[PDB]
Design a protein around this nucleic acid. Structure first.
Lengths: 128, 262
RNA sequence: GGACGGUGGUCAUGGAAGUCGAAAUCCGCUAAGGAGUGUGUAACAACUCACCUGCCGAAUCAACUAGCCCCGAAAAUGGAUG
């Protein structure tokens, strides 16, 4: 898996799409339109970690608001717990109601059946 | 499990849970995943998990004796033929019939590329035709005993053939070349060693369940009924038109060798 | 001989991303299936391994204590415990 990171709607940034290659495997501003036409949704906000696969003159990306990003978007909080496992530097206390509905979008991709099972993953991952 | 430290990690506790689980269900089947991957097992387990469910354990799995010691039967260590557990077995306890379970498990198996050094479960074959790969080390295919040539600037397999036979080990080189070809020969899932239901022990030859062979024997057996029905003249509904003609055919016939014209 | 997915683990930093350094070690989906044991490339690239299973079949491992021996142990005209 080869890491790019993005903020909603961006294109062409010299530090982020040049020394990580232009996906399409040649031609930045294929992927630079292709990510932007997908990831221009709501405003640029908190970052998603976004994932590249490269094929024979093709780019393709996995975003599925990458679980720390799903929590990031539900919270409205841009970082992660710093001084850990204990008592956050930012103020991001997730609701019970946030935690099921994120798990619901995760629930093909935690391979899932039950909610009260996929709630545990995300709760371990949201308090770590 | 997640409790990696010494605390149980059980003996008699899981065997007691396994105990009630045999006693709960009518049919118990003993099966092999060892061929199957981890996820691949979960997805077969998923189908079974809706209908009625299966457990793994070790020598605590041999304790088909304690359940039998609880009830009165013959699925155990003592009365059974030779206990059909093999290495890497689990137990599937169910509401589902044995024939149906065999079809469920055996009929839907998941394909899974072969492995180097694994014994082929079935004959492996390669098809003739262009690989679509440009010229390179075609020689590796020939080393494997796949005849090959360059045709139209592409590497092609000359003819179909069986690369390895069933029960024979797959060489490393062979596996690697088959994989490059994109060939996925092997079928994995839970293999059935045995089934118990209601005082009887069923082996995998039973469970793979013939079934066309009775359609021919039913049609023949019905033709045996039908035959008897035309010739005999015994007419409730089916048999009845076929008989009438037997007095006439025999007569129409009587005209053919002969020397009246009438 | 078995190890899917969340997820190219959060910090930090050219850089970890299992594998410089430091959170943190849960679970769905599971019969077994750790956010990993040592080998990698500037960095990107694979293989094994935790746990679990087979084959094998019977003792194993940990630890205290003690004896003798062994070691430390090189010198002068020629070898000995008389």
């Amino acid at each position: 898996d080869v890491f790019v990171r993005v903020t909603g709607g961006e294109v062409g940034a010299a530090s982020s799409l040049a020394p990580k290659i232009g996906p399409l495997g040649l031609s930045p501003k294929k992927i630079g339109e292709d990510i932007a036409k997908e990831t221009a949704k709501d405003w640029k906000g908190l970052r998603v970690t976004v994932k590249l696969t490269v094929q024979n003159r093709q780019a393709k990306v996995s975003v599925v608001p990458s679980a720390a990003a799903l929590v990031i978007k539900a919270l409205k909080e841009p970082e992660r717990d710093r001084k850990k496992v204990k008592n956050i530097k930012h103020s991001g206390n997730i609701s019970l109601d946030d935690v099921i509905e994120i798990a619901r979008i995760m629930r093909n991709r935690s391979m899932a059946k039950e909610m009260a099972g996929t709630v545990k993953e995300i709760l371990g991952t949201c308090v770590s | 499990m997640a409790i990696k430290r010494t605390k149980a990690e059980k003996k008699v506790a899981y065997d007691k849970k396994l105990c009630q689980l045999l006693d709960e269900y009518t049919k118990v089947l003993i099966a092999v995943a060892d061929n199957v991957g981890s996820n691949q097992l979960q997805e077969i387990r998923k189908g079974l998990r809706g209908d009625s469910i299966v457990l793994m354990g070790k020598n605590t799995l041999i304790r088909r004796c304690i359940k039998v010691h609880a009830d009165n039967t013959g699925n155990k260590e003592f009365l059974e033929l030779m206990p059909l557990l093999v290495g890497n077995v689990g137990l599937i306890f169910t509401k589902g019939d044995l024939k149906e379970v065999r079809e469920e498990v055996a009929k839907y198996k998941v394909g899974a590329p072969a492995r180097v050094g694994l014994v082929a479960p079935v004959d492996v074959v390669v098809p003739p035709g262009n690989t679509g790969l440009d010229p390179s080390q075609t020689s590796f295919f020939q080393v494997l005993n796949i005849p090959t040539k360059i045709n139209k600037g592409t590497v092609e397999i000359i003819t179909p053939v069986e690369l390895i036979k069933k029960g024979d080990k797959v060489g490393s080189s062979e596996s690697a070349l088959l994989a490059k070809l994109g060939i996925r020969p092997f079928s994995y899932g839970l293999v059935i060693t045995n089934v118990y239901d209601s005082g009887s022990v069923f082996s995998p030859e039973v469970l793979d369940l013939t079934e066309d062979d009775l359609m021919e024997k039913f049609a023949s057996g019905v033709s045996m009924v039908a035959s008897v029905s035309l010739a005999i003249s015994y007419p409730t509904i089916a048999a009845a038109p076929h008989m009438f003609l037997n007095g006439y055919k025999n007569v129409l016939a009587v005209a053919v060798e002969t020397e009246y014209s009438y």
